[PDB]
């Protein structure tokens, strides 16, 4: 009636506060943080192929413009558009600007194909000030710019390409709008011009808008662009009076297209990433991150919050005397253990299976709580220069929704989580002093406080047989029993 | 101290792996898939009402191009597009073409009203060697074409139709666009031609478009269809100069729209089903299917997962002994019981208390795991033959969105219910042990494998006493302190 | 051997049924609503600032039409637009109505900035008998009617106004549509008419349409508006030789743009509110509501339920005896407590330190339940009169998304919460039993009923001894083994 075991768990000085379901601040021993807030000051060029547009948007890219020449036969996962890009040739305009930007970008490479049009009489390779390359008149090297001949003929134009191949043309030409009646009939002779681009199931006809615009590098006049998809077995018709800005070829499109666009000022450094933001590459395990929505590649959830707290250990409670209100700051060595006094003196020591216990069913979610993926690639625009309305509305109530639901998410999973870590650890303590209750059986009793008074001789080897599971009470049962009733 | 009473919990030889918050696999005694992952190779004509397009898409069927007959007067939940549908008629295309098919396809019903326009001079029923029924010519029979007179006159059409009705009027309606000059006065005179149609809040005019388009069906003319939709108290107007494809009448709408269209090869069986995939139709229970995204009905919510498991039983441990770390094979009509032995030997018996308390609190789950019966009919196109840009790509963005929530949610509904299952089976199995060990009080001892060793003879019928909570512990209390500690 | 304590927890005779992952039904002694299902009848025009249309829409206040001038220098977070507001003005159409719309709300200011724009010798200020103003033919009053001179010429027109301020500027003008060839002579000579509008890098062209339309106010004519935003250091050029519906000047654009519009017909009460649905304001702390879709402000997320109630409180079970399935309708200062029957007579008294530790984890619950801010303006639409395709399909769907995914949220999280909230409760329960075990050791046995029969002499402040854990079980340790066991 004089040895006394206890059983317990570590603690520590002061650990970190978590979430739970109940308690909005938990103090717990260990915890891990679950939101990504710091970037790379750079975008990483592996795994993934990033192309610079550099001085060239992706448009312009695409049309031939004086300084895009580094971009001819490129092939990207991702284009990187620069912010302070400059348009350096003939003004122009795209209806459904956005649309052909996101075709451009999705394809994913500039696989120019020439082609020769046999056009009439008509002069070719129109040129101008508008469009210097070093200090030559130029223009788009992709588009050709067809005015009347020495003889003042402008025939109708009727040509015609079939695609019998197995990918997809892309067809870029424009139409050209002058800015006074002497500028279309000294270019064009007719007045009006006329343009109409046919395949077999659709149809653009463009009528050009005489009038002046302000003027952009020297010009007042402007050019449309346009673009037709021609598939296998189908064809194009191009059919004109005047004003046509021809097409010298076509791009190949990919059959599957998994490339996208990132427009940012950020620089290409020498990284290793597979996620990008408009801030810069990523280079963490976490499953959220704070930094931006505008995410390109294998990347975290992009949450509202700044911190997420994941108790990777038990409850932290500080300060002769297991647990009940007890914390042992002097257990290194496991998660829980004994600590008993006999004749011999004291000591604590550490219990492996328990410890073990705990561990696998907290760090057994280590494995499940970043599962997924999350590789996204061709996306949506999320950020704009300016209101266009119903469409841009659209498009931000979608990512803000988006953006809302998983934040919420974020937020119940890691109380949820904790909930459980709390929970686990707690039943693992119990399950440790249960397990010890029923060995001793009756030779000996709860005190109370996490601890057993043993009623017999118990020396270090008998302390040893409790831990490992050995000790046999029948041996201690008749002295045991007869020091606890009489 | 001879008789000894157990209690213990059923196991199997094998049992199925399943998720919860800790543990990524845990062994179960059983299991239920909740990902549906099976079609039927067809699609079930009940109880929703399928139309069958066959040859015809529900723009041809609209317009009544031959081989579209069969849809006359048609009503449908879902429509059935084929994607092996062909034009049998002049060739023609729709500005906003997903926009009319959206419309023809929510709407529910090809329910023709026929109108008489009294059109001037001008030549009806125009017809063409690219629209024959039977190797006659012909042209669509929801359209009228009207050409210049026998004395060559195509006089300013202007006529008007007055919704008086209680239900909203489309009127579908084209503009032909002739391939030359000649063309265009050898049926409408005139040139320009030109249409105006009109409501009083609304209005559309259409300028024809002259040139050379491939040869489709013997013709490089195009018609361009419109629609006009006309509610009560508003009223049309037909305004034309030339090259107007006039309605014959209009079709009605419903007021409440909730019908859709399913495009697909899959034929129509005779199975019953409220579920619909491009795939085929589904016959389940389960709450999530992997199946397709394009799901039209009373459908399973689809998740990108190929399988999640739903714990219907408690974990399967296997191998004079109870509970611990023991389940009993032999135990194979109840989920708890007792297992016991005295003088007379041996037996197992179950526990239905606890066994039915355990079943209420997990059978009681999987009944609000069936609940929320999602019907969705009329949604959002899922896959594409092209990209287009931005709309496409907000479509792709929405439905990937959608995707990966509820995917997320399944996920952790599954690691949640399997987590709550496991510990109230556990719990249920502590409180068999605990009811008896408050029957038994000072008469026996916990012998630390789940059993209780009875120091005092319990015949058999003493046992049952037991297991039945009639155990009067004072009968024996005298005869079992005395074998305990004497 | 005679003297008995009992631990127990109240009870009501009624209760509320709750939801959680097993039951059905749970009663649970107190319950909260979730869902908000009350609104006034009426719009809180504190704090948000709320502008009144009355007869003027948005699109109408803007253009300047009769009655709308009230609306002048007007600043708004929500716009309340009328559903019977009514045209005044000449009959109009705005191609992209909607984007406009758009806008206009989210821009939040009617600032209008008048400018002179010296026309050349056409005659300016064209009035209507569609537009009177007090009596008056008028027009639009931002909006300025070129017609042509007295000496029948319309010139090219051709003027420049430079955004050389700092904010976005927004031009409103329109291009006029005649009825017959000679009201396209009457009043701009040349026929056709034509406009164009451009800046630096974006263009509009239109040309006039000519025909009969339903008369709409006494005019079979029609103006299309248009916009034109200009960035700072940006300009625009009006070229027109005819049918120009020139502006007066600009509106200017807040940078930041954060307001939005709600159509309804409520009225604007002098309640205060932040949440805003087109049925009336909502005043609640509930997180969630099931009024309306249509919500702006700082709103409870709308979800499809009807009710959602949340435990507050432990089970309830109703009707010496302890708690095994026993509650205490009698124990009404506390939650958990004793009760005894001694010599001097029986008693109850609840314990706080348990009572309080419940308390402090479901209380602890309820204010991260709704910690959310939900602070959702400009939006979507989410209402149509009548179909119009794509878009709105697309529409339609995100929305229904959004419902469904939030409506699962709630439904789960108030389950998870009364999972949570019942097993604390039953846990805390569990443990005071536990505790007074520990105190009593070897002096008492479990009754198994929740109560602990003592063995020995206990008087009133024994039972307070027991009650405030002073009790020393070694006093009275002999008198209670010898009256257990002999
Ligand atoms: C004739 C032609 O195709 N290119 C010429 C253009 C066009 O006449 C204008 O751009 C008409 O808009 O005018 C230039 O002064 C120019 O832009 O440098 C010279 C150039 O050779
Ligand atoms: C020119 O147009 C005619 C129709 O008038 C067409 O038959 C022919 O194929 C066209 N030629 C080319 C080269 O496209
Ligand atoms: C992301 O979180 C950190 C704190 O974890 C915060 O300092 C930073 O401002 C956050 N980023 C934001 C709010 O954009
Ligand atoms: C014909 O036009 C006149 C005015 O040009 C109009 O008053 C009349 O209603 C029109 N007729 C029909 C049948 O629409
Ligand atoms: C659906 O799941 C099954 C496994 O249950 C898998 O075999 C099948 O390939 C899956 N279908 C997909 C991924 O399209
Ligand atoms: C008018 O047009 C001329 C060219 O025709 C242009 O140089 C000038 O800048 C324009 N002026 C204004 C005020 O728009
Ligand atoms: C909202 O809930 C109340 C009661 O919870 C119900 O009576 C009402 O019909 C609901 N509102 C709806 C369904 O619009």
């Given at each position: 009636?004089?040895?006394?075991?206890?059983?317990?768990?570590?603690?520590?000085?002061?650990?970190?506060?978590?979430?739970?379901?109940?308690?909005?601040?938990?103090?717990?021993?260990?915890?891990?943080?679950?939101?990504?807030?710091?970037?790379?000051?750079?975008?990483?060029?592996?795994?993934?192929?990033?192309?610079?547009?550099?001085?060239?948007?992706?448009?312009?890219?695409?049309?031939?413009?004086?300084?895009?020449?580094?971009?001819?036969?490129?092939?990207?996962?991702?284009?990187?558009?620069?912010?302070n890009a400059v348009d350096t040739c003939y003004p122009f305009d795209v209806?459904?600007?956005?649309?052909?930007?996101?075709?451009?970008?999705?394809?994913?490479?500039?696989?120019?194909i020439a082609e020769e049009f046999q056009w009439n009489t008509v002069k070719?390779?129109?040129?101008?000030?508008?469009?210097?390359?070093?200090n030559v008149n130029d223009f788009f090297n992709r588009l050709n710019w067809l005015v009347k001949s020495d003889?003042?003929?402008y025939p109708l134009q009727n040509l015609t390409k079939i695609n019998n191949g197995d990918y997809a043309r892309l067809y870029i030409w424009g139409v050209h709008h002058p800015s006074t009646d002497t500028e279309q009939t000294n270019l064009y002779k007719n007045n009006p011009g006329g343009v109409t681009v046919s395949t077999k199931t659709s149809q653009t006809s463009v009528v050009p808008n005489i009038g002046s615009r302000p003027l952009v590098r020297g010009q007042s006049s402007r050019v449309s662009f346009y673009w037709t998809i021609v598939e296998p077995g189908d064809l194009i018709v191009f059919n004109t009076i005047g004003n046509l800005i021809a097409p010298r070829g076509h791009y190949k499109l990919n059959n599957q297209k998994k490339s996208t666009?990132?427009?940012?000022?950020?620089?290409?450094?020498?990284?290793?990433?597979?996620?990008?933001?408009?801030?810069?590459?990523?280079?963490?395990?976490?499953?959220?991150?704070?930094?931006?929505?505008?995410?390109?590649?294998?990347?975290?959830?992009?949450?509202?919050?700044?911190?997420?707290?994941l108790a990777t250990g038990m409850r932290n409670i500080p300060e002769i005397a297991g647990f009940i209100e007890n914390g042992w700051q002097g257990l290194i060595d496991g998660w829980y253990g004994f600590?008993?006094?006999?004749?011999?003196?004291?000591?604590?020591?550490?219990?492996?299976?328990?410890?073990?216990?705990?561990?696998?069913?907290?760090?057994?979610?280590?494995?499940?709580?970043?599962?997924?993926?999350?590789?996204?690639?061709?996306?949506?625009?999320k950020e704009f220069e300016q209101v266009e309305g119903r469409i841009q509305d659209l498009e931000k109530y979608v990512?803000?929704?988006?953006?809302d639901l998983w934040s919420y998410n974020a937020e119940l999973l890691v109380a949820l989580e904790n909930q459980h870590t709390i929970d686990v650890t707690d039943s693992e303590m119990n399950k440790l002093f249960e397990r010890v209750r029923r060995q001793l059986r009756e030779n000996a009793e709860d005190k109370?406080?996490?601890?057993?008074?043993?009623?017999?001789?118990?020396?270090?080897?008998?302390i040893e047989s409790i831990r490992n599971g050995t000790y046999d009470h029948d041996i201690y049962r008749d002295e045991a029993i007869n020091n606890r009733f009489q």
């Open positions: 009636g004089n040895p006394v075991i206890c059983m317990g768990h570590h603690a520590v000085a002061n650990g970190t506060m978590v979430k739970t379901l109940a308690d909005d601040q938990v103090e717990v021993v260990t915890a891990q943080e679950l939101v990504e807030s710091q970037n790379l000051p750079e975008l990483c060029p592996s795994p993934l192929r990033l192309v610079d547009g550099q001085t060239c948007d992706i448009i312009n890219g695409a049309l031939g413009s004086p300084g895009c020449d580094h971009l001819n036969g490129a092939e990207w996962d991702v284009f990187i558009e620069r912010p209806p459904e600007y956005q649309s052909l930007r996101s075709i451009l970008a999705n394809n994913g490479k500039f696989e120019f070719q390779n129109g040129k101008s000030g508008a469009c210097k390359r070093a003889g003042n003929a666009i990132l427009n940012t000022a950020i620089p290409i450094g020498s990284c290793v990433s597979k996620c990008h933001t408009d801030k810069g590459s990523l280079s963490t395990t976490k499953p959220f991150q704070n930094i931006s929505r505008i995410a390109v590649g294998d990347c975290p959830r992009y949450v509202k919050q700044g911190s997420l707290k600590r008993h006094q006999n004749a011999e003196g004291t000591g604590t020591a550490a219990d492996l299976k328990s410890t073990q216990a705990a561990i696998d069913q907290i760090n057994g979610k280590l494995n499940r709580l970043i599962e997924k993926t999350n590789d996204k690639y061709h996306q949506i625009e990512e803000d929704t988006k953006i109370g406080n996490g601890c057993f008074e043993i009623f017999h001789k118990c020396d270090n080897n008998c």
